[PDB]
Nucleic acid binder design. Sequence first.
DNA 1: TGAAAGTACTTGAGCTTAGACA
RNA 2: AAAGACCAGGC
DNA 3: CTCAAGTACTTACGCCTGGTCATT
Length: 135
Amino acid sequence: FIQMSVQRIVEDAPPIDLQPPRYLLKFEQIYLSKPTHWERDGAPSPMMPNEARLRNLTYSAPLYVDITKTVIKEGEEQLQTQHQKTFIGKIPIMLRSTYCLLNGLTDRDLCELNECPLDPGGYFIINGSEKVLIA
DNA sequence: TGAAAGTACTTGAGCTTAGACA
RNA sequence: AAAGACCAGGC
DNA sequence: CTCAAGTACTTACGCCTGGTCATT
């Protein structure tokens, strides 16, 4: 879903056509970062899953896309403006997936994070509670 | 992705005739 | 906290 | 005007425990 489906969905959306000047919006490519928490002061910092549970936070990662804005002014010169890393929302991250902060960590690393090495993961942390999607 | 059934409504159809006596 | 929904579970 | 043949309502166990969530 993260690697393929999101990119396919954003690229398959029809471009925004507006109109007289014309405006075109195109979404180039998605970007996922590690799950980070934006505090009251706005300073980002990685969110560990245990901190998400205890503080009733949402273990999610921000989503950034590249947006190119094209204006047609009828003067034969269309000005295209590209925006990098445009934040459009946060996607909850399944625990121990590829994009989770627990990915690839050894038993000692997980213990240092107060996470059970035997915990299989595969569930989302929404508002502190642990949610599992059923097929 | 796959009730089931009973009841209260409508709506259409649609059918030889002749006058005298009777 | 109030009733609403949803979910899981016991017999 | 008046008979059979189509379209609408109306309902499907008994409790009991709890946890979560959005509105208020």
